[PDB]
Structure formats: structure tokens, C-alpha cells
Design a protein around this ligand. Sequence first.
Ligand SMILES: O=P(O)(O)OC[C@@H](O)[C@@H](O)[C@H](O)CO
Ligand SMILES: O=P(O)(O)OC[C@@H](O)[C@@H](O)[C@H](O)CO
Ligand SMILES: O=P(O)(O)OC[C@@H](O)[C@@H](O)[C@H](O)CO
Ligand SMILES: O=P(O)(O)OC[C@@H](O)[C@@H](O)[C@H](O)CO
Lengths: 262, 263, 262, 263
Amino acid sequence: KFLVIAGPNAIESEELLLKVGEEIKRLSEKFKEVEFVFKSSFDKANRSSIHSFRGHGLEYGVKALRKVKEEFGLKITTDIHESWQAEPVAEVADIIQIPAFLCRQTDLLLAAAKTGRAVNVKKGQFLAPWDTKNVVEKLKFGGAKEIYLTERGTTFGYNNLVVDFRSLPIMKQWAKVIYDATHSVQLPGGLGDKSGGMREFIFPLIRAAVAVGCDGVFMETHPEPEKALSDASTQLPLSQLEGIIEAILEIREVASKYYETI
Amino acid sequence: EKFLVIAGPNAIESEELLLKVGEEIKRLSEKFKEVEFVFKSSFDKANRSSIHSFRGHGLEYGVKALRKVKEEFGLKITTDIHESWQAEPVAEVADIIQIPAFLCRQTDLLLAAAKTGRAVNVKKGQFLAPWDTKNVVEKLKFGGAKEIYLTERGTTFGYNNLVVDFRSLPIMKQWAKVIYDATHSVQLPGGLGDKSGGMREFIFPLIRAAVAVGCDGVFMETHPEPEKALSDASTQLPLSQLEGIIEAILEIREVASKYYETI
Amino acid sequence: KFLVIAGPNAIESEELLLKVGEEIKRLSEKFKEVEFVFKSSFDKANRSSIHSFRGHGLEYGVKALRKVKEEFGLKITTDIHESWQAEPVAEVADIIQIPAFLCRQTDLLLAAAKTGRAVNVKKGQFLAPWDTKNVVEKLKFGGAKEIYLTERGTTFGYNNLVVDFRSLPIMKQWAKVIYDATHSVQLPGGLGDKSGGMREFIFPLIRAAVAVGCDGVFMETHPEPEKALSDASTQLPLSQLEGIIEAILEIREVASKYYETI
Amino acid sequence: EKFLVIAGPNAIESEELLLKVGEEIKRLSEKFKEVEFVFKSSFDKANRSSIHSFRGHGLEYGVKALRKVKEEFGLKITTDIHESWQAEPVAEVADIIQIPAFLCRQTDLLLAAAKTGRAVNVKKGQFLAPWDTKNVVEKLKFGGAKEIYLTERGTTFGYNNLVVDFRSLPIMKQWAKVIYDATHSVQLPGGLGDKSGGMREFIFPLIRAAVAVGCDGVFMETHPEPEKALSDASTQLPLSQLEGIIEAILEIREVASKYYETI
Ligand SMILES: O=P(O)(O)OC[C@@H](O)[C@@H](O)[C@H](O)CO
Ligand SMILES: O=P(O)(O)OC[C@@H](O)[C@@H](O)[C@H](O)CO
Ligand SMILES: O=P(O)(O)OC[C@@H](O)[C@@H](O)[C@H](O)CO
Ligand SMILES: O=P(O)(O)OC[C@@H](O)[C@@H](O)[C@H](O)CO
């Protein structure tokens, strides 16, 4: 069924994770037609500034995620940054996430594939839709069987990303496609020491993604985005999550009739 | 508000081609009564890549052909102008005067269109940012236009390729009604060397995106046999697929509409 | 010999034209190895804002240019915007300039070609280097024999232009190539009601143009750029013109040894 | 100040290939005494497009091969790391630790390199704006690096193409020494499907541009027979053309130098 990956960008505290996890569990009970997957990063390994928030470590993060998985029975997904992290993260993560900048790092991909878990790769901002065919092949080579490719924007001049929706049908030829509604509107390093983004475009582009056709949506949410330690400009208020999910399910129900074959 | 659907053959290859397409557009206007149809066709392709490509049969012949369509089917008309002098005559038959993409910054052309009292639809230049359209609309208001449209037809993305940045729809809606050109948006500028190329397979998906995001109309060129078109042969929709595409976007629009943001 | 097209962006007054023309005449006498061509627009037909400066008309402009041509004996070049202007402008203009946004408008090209004058086309920001082959062909078709193609930047995201120097050798296959050092660094509609630009990059990129190899340089200059009515952000101070010309001639003398064939 | 020339075969195909190229680089270092030569070659291509493409013979073998080059020719050495653990061992032989383009934002990799006391050269990511390199340099200074380099290797321009925005050279010079990668800049990412393509014919002209603008060094991969390279076969310079290219850029640099701006 339709996939909805959601949660706070970073594991700011396992307390925050339980709050968001609670709301996601509720939506999970309300939308049985949807498969929810809780997402959160145990470490922001690519911040622009050395002085920005990274996280509390892999140990504290895997622990907090497991708490969410046991307390709410929600599947989990977090991203790895170096080959060694794959195995420990697989203990809890149902889906292992490969960062966009790292989408061509063979060993990271193979490490993830080896865990036997499902793998979701963020399409690099420097990658062409058709170039993702090779990414999928690496994973298959490594034994991955459940592979996802996530659209999250493409380099368009400086400090800007554009979403070429032509990629959704193109990538669908070799993998399930997920649309990242949060990072697609951010402005890389836009604020100097941080990245920007325009929240006002999140919903409009998400509606476009389902109208075009995708297997799932990725959307980061936080009780108080403004206070978020990371991706503050683009995180969605927890309270708006329900309305957007219902909205995309309705659009999908009608649009699906026209989704092209293969 | 009534949804606008601008459709027709890219170029006025002949008065007969126009009546052929017009007949189908008239049939559809009868079924889709919640839609305002506008018949489009250029009397001249003044910007072909090659000197050897088809241009047209002239302004005189073209306007005559468009008038025939309006009289026989009672359909509104739109066509593009290329130099200021053409505004006046074209305004005699055109309900909406279209301003080519490459020309969206030419002050005199915009002014010439504006003073005719007709509606004006500006194709957003491939070099223009969405927020730069505010001044385009200002120029038109200054020249007297009361009904203004801004059309999204793609932006330069590397060489011989265009990308559609859907953030442009809500941005431009701040100062004008917004039209999405479903056919030129999948065009590959100069892609075939002496001609431009295109990917027909992406027309429908992107048009669904456009209506899900929210726009006031769609512009899509159609032709009985796209393969034989004298222009835009790679992006023109087969006339028989027109009805289905329209039904589909009216359906996606309806279900999405309640979520369109207020500007 | 090496071509140097220079002058004030717009004909703000024939007074301004005579001042700049005087300095250019002096450089002309000092650099006999160079062919100077005085440039100025009788009308800015594509301003972003309706409230910006356009000019004093085609009559007043052609008159002022002729004054420069007679008083200093300098060849002339100005740009046309609609087909009818070609003939009258040819009376004075040795080289007719085709605006970048208008580089694919067949009739404008043919009108210019018909005058028997030389034609210089600004490569559209939306055009690929190889796409200029067709532009040249239109002109030849129209009877033009002295054809130039000017590099002036390419659309790179929003409100930004990038100079792909690969274009210089590519366009050279079918026409003489001129590098526009002034418009290449401007930021389209950058100031909202006007375009921006960074003067600090003009000289560096001009040095690159001659190191790569081009048949000429196009450079706008003004006694007091800050007061210029158009392109204020990118116009070069008249006083710096001599030093830059000498600089490019020296770089060209050494570099020319390595300019690739054809 | 001494001009830096980083050259060598893209990948350590064998210790013999290295000695072959090293021998010529040593001969050239003897002639061009005003130049500081640094021998480059990767012990691993950790980011190939295809799983079936050549990667290398391992870190152990590679470092052993690079050491042989340093001992036999007395040349400085540089090679890239892909994960933090590799910094320490690689630092035993590498004078300059290179950080791959796609990895220019990975904090731990940068930190690992910085704490070795070796010089660090960061390839500017194809997704990074020139002004965004300031934080990259800050991270390195924070981790202990005292000798830092930023390499220009092109920016994403549409699909499967890169463009070099020479404005990056003076911009980046504000916080670090600047190197121009003459070979990867003409590369066509994923251009050949399972491999990347490239246009060798543009290497020389763009390198002339780089030195005319002003930079502190050039990075150019060379190989006895580019056509047979196991990687970057499309952008690697034939070893015999190396000498001429270097002479030419030293000449253009000299004549242009008096015009280089002060930052
Ligand atoms: O530019 P800054 O603010 O460090 O932001 C980096 C974020 O955008 C980052 O961690 C994001 O989730 C990266 O992919
Ligand atoms: O590049 P060619 O095929 O001449 O095409 C130009 C057309 O696509 C053109 O007339 C289009 O309708 C231009 O705006
Ligand atoms: O954006 P504004 O300030 O109107 O500027 C337009 C100038 O850049 C313009 O006339 C220039 O010489 C156009 O090509
Ligand atoms: O796309 P392929 O040919 O695998 O190439 C990747 C190379 O060009 C690569 O290793 C280059 O040296 C990457 O940064």
C-alpha cells in the first residue's frame, strides 16, 4: 500500500521522538490504507557549519528509535553515513536510508544491502533520473530486494533546487519511488551557516507528486518547527500532518486511474 | 471560476486543418460546459531554429482562417504576435493576444497588445524567474490590459532541455491568472539540430501535476496526426486523446481544489 | 585585427557619447593593432520595469552616433529591435547588433542582413553553443557576409548567468566570436526593478576570454557608472579602459600561440 | 609563490603505471623548477557509476605503490580518502589528503583528514556554490588543518553536463588556496550510461582560462594511453602532451599575473 515516511528530521531527544511517534501512531490507526514508517536521523553528518547540531550519537539514537518501535509498533527508518553503521542500525531500522550526497558510494550501498533490510536511496542533487538505474543495480548486486529511490530535488543554479517531476515515471522503471516533500523545497546553504527553504511550497508540490504518481511520500514533521535544531525552515507542524495525508489520499484515489503503465 | 483550456494546432498549416481541429474543440466545449475553450494557432512561426523550417502562410491568410473558425464554431480565438504592428489587425479576430516566450520583455510588443483592449497572455520566457513576471504584468496594466495571463512553459535547464518548476504557479498567481503550457514544457529546444525535439510521454503526467498544484487554465496543442505536423511535431497531442486528457484534469482539479492555497 | 567594441550602454545624451568617444579615439590612436568600434543603444527595448530609462528615440540616437562617427572617425554599432529599424540604422551603423532575447527572430536577422552591413548576434541566454550554427545560416541566407556571435552568458538557475567558455571554440567553427565582458556578469532582474551584476568579475573573465581565444571583446564603459541610467552595476569606469585593453593585448600575444585550429 | 601542479594517472591501475608516469613527472619537475609537483592517483574509485567498473587493488596495495613513487622519485604525494578510518594510514605517505567532490560536506571525513597534520585538498562538490566553501574551510581549520586547498572541478548544469563558473576562483581565494581540475571539469557525468563521458578537446582552452583568471595550482590527470585507462578514459591527458600544457600555463600565468586582483 501507499507509503508515508514521516518524523522529526533529527533525534533531538527521545522525548521529541515519542511525541511525534504518538501522533503518527494515531494517523496509522486512522489510515489503514497507508503504511507509516517513522523516520529520524541519529546524526546530521553533512551540516554546512561545524557549529551546527549533529545529534547524540548512534547508540543513543538507535536506542530512542527502538523505544518508538516497541512503544508504538511503528516500522523504522534512519540514514547511515559510513559502512560500519549499517549492521548496528539494521537492528532497529526496517528501511536503511542512503543520504543524497552519498548515493554513489558503493560500499555504503553494499553495506546497507547486506543487512537484509530494505534500502531507500535519496537521489543525489547531481544525478539525472536515468542515472539511478546504476544505483539500483549496485543494491541488487549486494542482495537488496526491497529498493526505493527518493526524489528530493535537483541542483538548479546556486542555492536552489528544482523538482523535475519527469523523474517519477523514469525512476519507476527500476524501483519504487518516494517523493521527499521536505528537502525538495529547501535552499542549500541559503542562510549562510544553514540551509533555507520555503514551507509554503511543500503542500503544493506534494499534491503534484501524487497527481503524477509515486509509491510513497517522505515528510518531516515537528511539534514546533521554528525550534527544530535542524531543517527548521522546511519541517511541517505536527498538527498539519493529518490534513495533508488525507489530501494526498483523495488526490491519489482519483489520479491513480491515469498513472501510466511501468 | 471557469477553467480555461487553450487548444489547437501549433501552426495554421491550412484553413482546413483549423476547421478539422475546431470541430472537435466545439464538440468538447458542448460536453465540458464548465470549461471556457479558446482556439489557438499561430499565423507565423517567427522564431524557428532553421531558415528552412515551416513558418506559415502569412498574417492575412492566418487571420482569415481564424475568423472562419470563430464564425463556424463560435469559439474564442488566440494567436501570437511578433512585432508591434501586428497587434491591431490580429486584435480584430483574437480574443486573447499571445506574447511569445523570447519576447516577454519587449516593452513595445506588450504595450501594443495591451492598448487593443483584448486579453493578453504572456508566455514566461525560459530565462525568466517566476518572481520577475511581476514587472511584466505591471507593464501590461500600464498599457491598459484588464485581463492578463501568465503561461508556464518551462525554464532553461542545461543545454537543449527545459524543466518545469511548479513553484512558479503559486508565485505568479500573486499578480495574474496562470496558464500551464502542457506541450511546450516537454520540448527539447534545438534537440534535433535543425529542429527542436520533445518527449510526448511526459505531457499527461506533468499536466496532472499542474492541476494538482493549481492553475487557472491549460494550454495544449493538438493535431490530427502529430507525426505530420509542420512544427512542434514532437510535442503535439493526437486530437483523439484530447477529450480524455481534459476529463482527467477536470477530475483532478475538482478533488484537489479544496486544498488550493489562498494568495 | 583584434576587435574592441566599447561605449556607453545607452545614448543618455549625445554629450555623453562625445566624451566616451573622445577617450576611445585616443585609445584607437594608441593601439593601432586593434580595431575599435563605438557602441551605444538608441533604445533599451527590454527593461524589466516600464518605469526605467529607455532612450531618446531612434532619430536622436542615429543623429548622435553619426556625430561620433564624423567627429572621431570611429566605426559604429547599435542594436535594432524590430525589422523596420534596420534600414535607417544602417545609414550610420557599420555593425548591426541583434539583442540576445531576439537572436531567433528570423525577420530581424534578415532585415539586418539585407542592409549589407555586418551583423553581430548576442547569443541568447537560452541557446546552446551549437545552436548558433542555425543563426549564422539565417544571416548567410539573407546575404550577410561579415557575421559575429557574441558570448554574453547563459541562464544558470534564477537571476544568474554563467559563462561556459567551451562556447568560444564551438561558435568559432561558423563565425567570428566576440566576448561581452559586461553583460556576462550581470544578474538578470537581480535588483527587482532592475538587473544586478558584479563589476569585480569583469576583468578576470575578460582575461579568460582572450586566454581561451576570441576575435574580439565587447565592453561597456561610462565616465561615472554609478550615475549611468542603465546597466549601472556592470559598466566600466572610462578611466580603467586603457589598462584593461593593454592587459588583454599582452595576454593575447602570449596565448595566441596556443589557440586551437578552426 | 610556487605554482602547484597536481598530476598523475586517475587510478592506481598498477605500481608499474605509477612509476611510468612518475618518471615523466620527475623529469618535468627538474625542468620546471618554479613549480611544485605533486603526484596523484587514487587507490580506490569508491564512487563509480557502475558496480562493474574498475575500482582498484585496495588501500594497502595503493599506499605501497604511492610510497614506491615517493622513494624512487622524491615526489610529494596526494590521494583521496573515502571514509574516516582511511585518513590515518593514507597520511603515512600522502602529503596532501584529497576529499572527493560528493563528500565535501561530510564533517567526519574532513575532521579525520585535518587531524593528521597533512595538507588537505577539497574538491568542490558539483552541488556547491563558491561562497558555500567558506564553511568547508572553517570545518578544516577547526579540525587542525593549516594548509588548505579548494579545487574547482565543475558544477551541475542540466543533466550529464558540468559547467565551470570561473567566478569561483576569486571567490574561493578569499579563504583558501585554489586549484583548478582541468580534467574532471570537462567530464560528462553518467554521459555513457554505465560510465561517465568527457570532452578532451576542451581541457587545454579551459586550463588557459583558469591561469588567466588566477589560481594557485592546476590538477590534471595524465596517462600513457588514455584510451586504455580503467577510469576517466575520456578526460585523461596523454602523458606526452603534459610538458607542453605546463609550459603554456606558466607562460600565460606570468603575463597575466601582474593583473591578478588582491583579495
Ligand atoms: O545547511 P545546514 O543547515 O547545515 O543544513 C543541512 C541540512 O539541510 C542537512 O543535515 C539535511 O537534512 C542534509 O541533507
Ligand atoms: O526549434 P524549432 O523546431 O524551429 O522550433 C521552434 C518551435 O518549437 C517554435 O516555433 C515554438 O513553437 C517556439 O517558440
Ligand atoms: O533589468 P533592467 O534593469 O531593466 O535591465 C535591462 C538591462 O540589463 C538591459 O536593457 C540590457 O542592456 C538588456 O539586455
Ligand atoms: O561515472 P564513472 O565512469 O563511474 O566515473 C566516475 C569517475 O569519473 C569517478 O571515479 C571520478 O573520478 C569521480 O569522482
